[PDB]
């Protein structure tokens, strides 16, 4: 059937009056929820346009409406009808079986259609758009929610009033960023609807500072085992309790039913698939707590409802499908003439949510036509003779794309308009519905805000945001930490991470990995890396170092007293027949060893440690030489004993200096604990062959001293002989005690060194006392 | 007009009978080169199909041909006619001015078209493909060379027989890789054809081991200044002498004219735009030398020509445009009845290159129809009643894509077939034409090879490759070099580079950059990097080192002789009242200095450096102490002089050893030349405070010796006194001479050290001789 209303400017019309019915019938039984209501809405819109004094005052508006019944071949044939009526007006009727006349001259062909207002489903809209691409005719839809038509490459002459899916994805992104829900999951659908929406959502996510936890898809219909598996995979992540949904109504209902059966609480926000329908939450009211829903902006129209109420098949015979709709709504037949008793005013009527979009499309087309007529021939309001061929390219790319007008039948409360972007898509105007948990009984959706160009909503109506009694429901991954514990570990996630402290001795210079520097130095607080840290020149405490200094001072005082007693008693008979010069050399050696023991506790460094070990070796050599001379020079001439003593001392000094110079006495800093500040404590001259050769030389010197001491028949000055014997015995005992002590305490930092220094000082003091005792006894006797 | 031929299965046809003529007429005057020839070819093809016993023996074949005249609206309306005839057969004629009957029942509507054979230009092909995409009808073209239709997303039910532009780009890539022409330039065009070809060529280039020099584009038509500028930019590169061209015929002719005007020799290969046309090379014969041309594979048909020769408007009234073509070819009108005198056999006829392609398209459609009829209803050869509704989806995606048949009117020489790829495009078969420089007069194209699936051509007909007298003309960038000079520099090119040698001391580890290692070591030949190179322990030559060794041996022999003379003459009066022990100490010091001078020419190392400098300092101190003792101990006790001498020697030794240990005597290797092998020649103990303190101590010792030399009234042993005076004078002179010599030659490698060693050896020998002369004189006197 064809619905034709006369007029100079006629517009196309497409509405699915019927529904799917299989290949048995033509295309299916007549529908009464989508097609007839939108058809009557378009008729009312054109009636108001014809009666509008401000809009199109001179010329009227025609109407050419064809059935679509949600079919493909039928819609294609109806588009062929439109194109044959529009373009084929140039060629007359060809030769056919018509014997009355050759061709039609005035009738049998309507005027060229200016535009078409039709196409609700995705497939029919795609087909109409692809068919009307080449014929240079504009096309506007009213329920085209598919986002695959936004591209102008495949669909150029196509516009829509409802917002596409990427607008809804942007609204989802805005409502997620408003609540700081960076860590969010997504659920897709295997149908035609949802894939482009999820793609746009993921693109907007990866665009600006937000990521996604997981990406799952749900099929059309299968066993509940797959639903249980996918919901378990969703709830597997403990930190994932918020997710977006882009599925249908039945799929959302079954998902909520499965969630209620599994008894798990979540905070779910969905797309327009949920909507304001109540059948999707039937039997699952205690499972959608704290849910956010996106509703398409649509307000009821009082004038359209009043016009639809006063409808009857008696005085309104224009619409051919009106009788079919009347027979479908009320079970009756017009043959028996019994349908007149029924009235439409008695039965309650609910307006379709798409009526406002249809009337907006019609009024936008009317405004575009008015603007074209005003900008083309402004001489008079009558029809211009220069616009008889409908030029769709100009009317599309010059007028309808840039429209600025207020919404029709809009209440004084709202302030909205109708515009189109560069892609010919309507602006995204949505409403936010919250699952309010009102204590007055049942739970129902509550309007809390709207999203047109900017997100403007309040928390005064949100149940989990109004009192702020507890923490705001949000999913976060790695937010809590500062620039003190920088380590980051990522098991399987790239967007977020796990903020973990690193080692305290490791520098902090990168926000993804922790760099571990050397153990001998600590990082700096200037945020530049890990380098050396300044140490102290003096490390030993004053109280502990006072002992060695006091011992050295006492030894020096004893040596000075012995030297003074030897100088004063220079004419004594005991010192005359003895090594007076050798006694002075021994006193000088004692002074030198005391000075070396005092300097051994100075600021440690390379030269410090080398001088300390050289002084220790020289002290050992000079004490051995002094003992050997006292054992030898007493009895082998008086000038050869000191000569060979100095010779052996110089030889031992050269040996030890060679042994210490052949090695590599560095100045490294080593700390015993794992994480501690490294300070200079000991020299790098660790266990090597130098100390072994020094110990071997000391042992050889001790053996020579013992061989010289083996004499026991000395009848002259037995007191000094027994004193030297006791002194060498004490020295050997101290050396034997310090050998295993130093060998076992070598791992110590300052205990072994201090113990060895104290032992050396005590041995030197004992030797000085034993040397001074013979001179004191000789002075007391004579 | 419509050409209708009876048949159960009717095939569609579209041909541009007319051409562009402006909006004044309908669409333009009738053509006689493209439309009528292809229309007659299709008519002859269907005529042969009807008489073919092997192909469609039972059922005939219909025809429905509509005019296109290379337009958009006309072709759109004629495709509208096809769709109205095919799909609208379900519904009868609507109510119209026809008063004879309600609607047509048998006539006024032909059967549904099974397929359509039409579309030559790009725009008409795009329009037909976009229109017939929705009605599930297959479409095959005969001259659709546009490559933007290969995608199945926008054009799914579209097939072609001519190869698209990407096949030609692949053929160009193959013929370029055959000649090893990696470095090539490209010239594009601003028209509709050429952009996708250049894009595919660049994609194939960047795909596998070949790059492009430049990418220029030429507009449609402008002044010659732009052409001169673009050709100058093309010839700017000296190594660029090979170019590909994807332009039209007129553009190629104008470019050849500009090149002949500029007088530049080039080797240019072009696309099918050049072809075998002779008007494009008129006036520019001496400019396209050594040119390669791609020609579309097309062979003449004898049967089609014989059928076209026997044509007349008397017994052939089917074609409506035949009368228009006859009136266009011969200037006459059928009103005067004077056109019968002219005959088509008299005037020569040239077959169009697209005749074979449309014939192959029609025969492929017939083969697909036969295969479908055989695989659907194999019961009988008659038409099946189950295939009355033409199902285009199965007929397309099951039969026309996979066809295996030989080409019609196939000459026994060639071996080719007709196939379609996954995108429904014909296989790429081209011919290679070479600008042969034959000495028989004018120059013309010569067929040298064909390209269907693999490049098979010979050089026996190529003028620049048959004798191989000179090098093959090829453009290369950075081919000549090996893994010996690895450096690479790239001024403005990324694909190729410039192969330049690097520094010989720099290791080779990457083919893009040269890594320069340290100067103190040379890279290895094992291709592992740059590390240290083994040196020699001994560096001084044997002949040069024999001098110092001989001097040391002579000094040691002199010292031994002096010691033996002193030991034998131990009872001499001169040696009795003198320092005999001091003489032995001086002899030992001479032996020590000789040993130090001998060891100073050993293998250089850290310990070697320390021992050498310590021995030099000890020798200086020992000679100073020996001189001081000889000046002092001769006259202040006999046991105190040697004591203070040994004390001063030990003090100087401690001073010099401290000065040498406080420094950092490394073991680095330094080479004087910039690029030479580094060997251990000079030590790390460079100019510092240690040598300054040593020189200061030596100067103080020399000043003390000179102060002791002030005695001039010695009456005992004046001979030894004057000998010691001459010795100390010679030593001071040698030291003063070696000071500035060393200060000036420190920059040398081995001259300064050898000179200093020789001077030290000479001074030691002179001192030994002066010391032995007094003992020798005393022995001679007594």
Short mmCIF file of C-alpha atoms in Angstrom, two decimals, chain A residues 347-589:
data_model
loop_
_atom_site.label_atom_id
_atom_site.label_comp_id
_atom_site.label_asym_id
_atom_site.label_seq_id
_atom_site.Cartn_x
_atom_site.Cartn_y
_atom_site.Cartn_z
CA UNK A 347 -8.18 1.91 26.36
CA UNK A 348 -5.08 3.55 27.91
CA UNK A 349 -2.37 4.59 25.46
CA UNK A 350 1.39 4.82 25.95
CA UNK A 351 3.43 6.98 23.59
CA UNK A 352 6.52 5.50 21.97
CA UNK A 353 9.93 6.82 23.00
CA UNK A 354 10.79 7.39 19.31
CA UNK A 355 7.86 9.72 18.54
CA UNK A 356 9.89 12.77 19.56
CA UNK A 357 12.74 11.67 17.28
CA UNK A 358 10.38 11.26 14.32
CA UNK A 359 8.81 14.68 14.86
CA UNK A 360 12.28 16.20 15.30
CA UNK A 361 13.43 14.68 12.01
CA UNK A 362 10.33 15.95 10.20
CA UNK A 363 10.71 19.45 11.63
CA UNK A 364 14.44 19.50 10.84
CA UNK A 365 13.67 18.58 7.23
CA UNK A 366 11.01 21.30 7.15
CA UNK A 367 13.46 23.86 8.56
CA UNK A 368 16.06 22.85 5.98
CA UNK A 369 13.53 23.24 3.17
CA UNK A 370 12.46 26.64 4.52
CA UNK A 371 16.08 27.81 4.75
CA UNK A 372 16.73 26.61 1.20
CA UNK A 373 13.64 28.40 -0.13
CA UNK A 374 14.63 31.58 1.72
CA UNK A 375 18.27 31.54 0.56
CA UNK A 376 17.41 30.56 -3.04
CA UNK A 377 14.41 32.72 -4.05
CA UNK A 378 13.64 35.37 -1.41
CA UNK A 379 11.35 37.30 -3.77
CA UNK A 380 8.12 35.76 -2.44
CA UNK A 381 6.86 32.98 -0.20
CA UNK A 382 5.38 31.13 -3.19
CA UNK A 383 7.13 28.19 -4.83
CA UNK A 384 10.15 29.17 -6.91
CA UNK A 385 10.20 28.02 -10.53
CA UNK A 386 14.01 27.61 -10.38
CA UNK A 387 13.92 24.77 -7.81
CA UNK A 388 11.63 22.27 -9.55
CA UNK A 389 14.50 19.74 -10.00
CA UNK A 390 15.22 18.65 -6.42
CA UNK A 391 18.95 19.20 -5.84
CA UNK A 392 19.76 16.93 -2.90
CA UNK A 393 23.48 17.73 -2.71
CA UNK A 394 22.99 21.42 -1.89
CA UNK A 395 20.00 20.81 0.40
CA UNK A 396 22.08 18.23 2.28
CA UNK A 397 25.54 19.80 2.58
CA UNK A 398 24.32 23.39 2.96
CA UNK A 399 21.15 23.50 5.08
CA UNK A 400 20.24 20.36 7.04
CA UNK A 401 23.74 19.74 8.40
CA UNK A 402 23.84 23.19 10.05
CA UNK A 403 20.45 23.67 11.73
CA UNK A 404 19.85 25.87 14.78
CA UNK A 405 16.31 25.60 16.16
CA UNK A 406 14.54 24.74 19.39
CA UNK A 407 12.99 21.35 20.05
CA UNK A 408 9.25 21.18 19.27
CA UNK A 409 6.68 20.69 22.03
CA UNK A 410 9.49 21.14 24.55
CA UNK A 411 8.36 22.07 28.08
CA UNK A 412 9.57 25.34 29.58
CA UNK A 413 11.66 23.39 32.11
CA UNK A 414 14.15 21.91 29.64
CA UNK A 415 16.45 23.95 27.39
CA UNK A 416 17.67 21.81 24.48
CA UNK A 417 18.13 22.13 20.72
CA UNK A 418 18.64 19.91 17.67
CA UNK A 419 21.99 19.96 15.88
CA UNK A 420 24.13 17.70 13.71
CA UNK A 421 27.89 17.18 13.73
CA UNK A 422 30.18 16.85 10.71
CA UNK A 423 29.13 13.19 10.37
CA UNK A 424 25.44 14.14 10.27
CA UNK A 425 24.72 12.58 13.67
CA UNK A 426 22.52 14.05 16.38
CA UNK A 427 24.00 15.31 19.62
CA UNK A 428 24.18 12.88 22.52
CA UNK A 429 21.48 13.68 25.08
CA UNK A 430 21.01 11.00 27.75
CA UNK A 431 19.42 10.68 31.18
CA UNK A 432 21.01 9.03 34.22
CA UNK A 433 18.78 6.65 36.19
CA UNK A 434 19.84 5.43 39.64
CA UNK A 435 18.51 2.30 41.37
CA UNK A 436 17.25 4.15 44.44
CA UNK A 437 16.79 2.00 47.55
CA UNK A 438 13.84 3.92 48.98
CA UNK A 439 12.48 2.60 52.26
CA UNK A 440 8.87 3.09 51.14
CA UNK A 441 8.63 -0.41 49.66
CA UNK A 442 9.58 -1.51 46.15
CA UNK A 443 12.67 -0.19 44.36
CA UNK A 444 12.42 1.84 41.16
CA UNK A 445 14.64 4.01 38.98
CA UNK A 446 15.11 7.67 39.88
CA UNK A 447 16.22 10.44 37.52
CA UNK A 448 19.39 12.04 38.87
CA UNK A 449 21.01 13.88 35.94
CA UNK A 450 21.39 14.40 32.22
CA UNK A 451 24.30 14.40 29.76
CA UNK A 452 24.01 16.56 26.63
CA UNK A 453 27.38 18.31 26.19
CA UNK A 454 28.65 18.30 29.77
CA UNK A 455 28.10 15.90 32.64
CA UNK A 456 25.92 17.72 35.21
CA UNK A 457 24.63 15.41 37.94
CA UNK A 458 24.19 15.63 41.71
CA UNK A 459 24.71 13.09 44.48
CA UNK A 460 21.67 14.23 46.49
CA UNK A 461 19.61 11.34 45.06
CA UNK A 462 22.27 8.59 44.92
CA UNK A 463 21.79 6.14 47.82
CA UNK A 464 25.50 5.26 48.16
CA UNK A 465 26.65 8.88 47.75
CA UNK A 466 24.13 11.07 49.63
CA UNK A 467 25.03 10.42 53.31
CA UNK A 468 28.73 9.66 52.70
CA UNK A 469 28.65 7.41 55.76
CA UNK A 470 31.18 4.98 54.29
CA UNK A 471 33.85 5.07 51.60
CA UNK A 472 32.78 5.83 48.05
CA UNK A 473 32.47 2.62 45.98
CA UNK A 474 35.45 2.68 43.62
CA UNK A 475 37.95 0.22 42.15
CA UNK A 476 41.60 1.28 42.23
CA UNK A 477 44.83 -0.59 41.51
CA UNK A 478 48.05 1.18 42.56
CA UNK A 479 47.17 4.68 43.78
CA UNK A 480 48.44 4.73 47.42
CA UNK A 481 52.17 5.52 47.63
CA UNK A 482 54.49 8.51 47.40
CA UNK A 483 58.00 9.36 46.18
CA UNK A 484 59.57 7.29 48.98
CA UNK A 485 58.81 3.67 48.00
CA UNK A 486 59.11 3.70 44.22
CA UNK A 487 59.28 0.00 43.31
CA UNK A 488 56.66 -1.30 40.88
CA UNK A 489 55.75 -4.90 40.01
CA UNK A 490 53.34 -5.87 37.21
CA UNK A 491 52.36 -9.57 37.08
CA UNK A 492 50.04 -9.46 34.08
CA UNK A 493 48.72 -5.90 33.80
CA UNK A 494 50.19 -3.06 31.74
CA UNK A 495 47.99 -0.05 32.54
CA UNK A 496 48.25 -0.21 36.33
CA UNK A 497 50.83 -1.93 38.53
CA UNK A 498 51.57 -2.87 42.15
CA UNK A 499 53.38 -0.22 44.20
CA UNK A 500 55.96 -2.02 46.36
CA UNK A 501 58.88 -0.58 48.37
CA UNK A 502 62.40 -1.29 47.14
CA UNK A 503 65.70 -1.76 48.95
CA UNK A 504 66.70 1.26 51.08
CA UNK A 505 70.24 1.20 49.63
CA UNK A 506 68.92 1.42 46.05
CA UNK A 507 68.57 4.76 44.27
CA UNK A 508 65.22 6.03 42.99
CA UNK A 509 65.41 7.39 39.45
CA UNK A 510 62.68 5.55 37.50
CA UNK A 511 58.99 4.97 38.21
CA UNK A 512 58.87 1.47 36.67
CA UNK A 513 62.04 -0.29 37.88
CA UNK A 514 64.36 -0.01 40.88
CA UNK A 515 68.09 0.36 40.22
CA UNK A 516 70.43 -1.24 42.77
CA UNK A 517 73.76 0.57 43.06
CA UNK A 518 76.96 -0.62 44.72
CA UNK A 519 77.15 -1.71 48.33
CA UNK A 520 80.12 0.54 49.13
CA UNK A 521 78.05 3.72 48.76
CA UNK A 522 74.54 4.96 49.50
CA UNK A 523 72.17 6.97 47.28
CA UNK A 524 71.74 10.71 47.72
CA UNK A 525 68.56 12.57 48.67
CA UNK A 526 69.01 15.09 45.83
CA UNK A 527 67.29 12.68 43.38
CA UNK A 528 70.30 12.35 41.08
CA UNK A 529 71.43 8.73 41.49
CA UNK A 530 73.60 6.67 43.83
CA UNK A 531 77.18 7.84 44.39
CA UNK A 532 79.76 7.98 47.17
CA UNK A 533 78.83 9.44 50.55
CA UNK A 534 81.32 11.56 52.54
CA UNK A 535 82.96 9.78 55.47
CA UNK A 536 84.92 10.91 58.53
CA UNK A 537 88.71 11.20 58.69
CA UNK A 538 88.84 9.96 62.31
CA UNK A 539 86.76 6.89 63.19
CA UNK A 540 88.11 5.58 66.51
CA UNK A 541 86.50 7.03 69.61
CA UNK A 542 88.46 9.34 71.89
CA UNK A 543 87.89 7.17 74.96
CA UNK A 544 89.17 4.02 73.24
CA UNK A 545 92.06 5.81 71.51
CA UNK A 546 93.16 7.46 74.77
CA UNK A 547 94.48 4.09 75.95
CA UNK A 548 96.94 3.63 73.09
CA UNK A 549 98.00 7.28 73.24
CA UNK A 550 98.60 6.99 76.99
CA UNK A 551 100.59 3.78 76.49
CA UNK A 552 102.72 5.45 73.81
CA UNK A 553 103.29 8.48 76.05
CA UNK A 554 104.31 6.24 78.96
CA UNK A 555 106.70 4.31 76.72
CA UNK A 556 108.23 7.53 75.41
CA UNK A 557 108.64 8.85 78.96
CA UNK A 558 110.30 5.61 80.05
CA UNK A 559 112.66 5.71 77.06
CA UNK A 560 113.53 9.35 77.78
CA UNK A 561 114.20 8.54 81.44
CA UNK A 562 116.42 5.61 80.46
CA UNK A 563 118.33 7.80 78.01
CA UNK A 564 118.79 10.51 80.64
CA UNK A 565 120.01 7.98 83.20
CA UNK A 566 122.47 6.58 80.65
CA UNK A 567 123.72 10.06 79.76
CA UNK A 568 124.15 11.12 83.39
CA UNK A 569 125.81 7.83 84.40
CA UNK A 570 128.16 7.78 81.41
CA UNK A 571 131.19 7.05 83.61
CA UNK A 572 129.71 3.96 85.27
CA UNK A 573 131.84 0.79 85.09
CA UNK A 574 128.89 -1.23 83.77
CA UNK A 575 128.14 1.16 80.90
CA UNK A 576 131.84 1.64 80.08
CA UNK A 577 132.35 -2.04 79.17
CA UNK A 578 129.09 -2.21 77.22
CA UNK A 579 127.30 -0.79 74.19
CA UNK A 580 126.63 2.79 75.26
CA UNK A 581 126.15 3.78 71.62
CA UNK A 582 124.16 0.57 71.23
CA UNK A 583 122.07 1.58 74.26
CA UNK A 584 121.40 4.95 72.60
CA UNK A 585 120.44 3.14 69.38
CA UNK A 586 118.06 0.92 71.36
CA UNK A 587 116.51 3.98 73.01
CA UNK A 588 116.06 5.56 69.58
CA UNK A 589 114.42 2.39 68.31
#
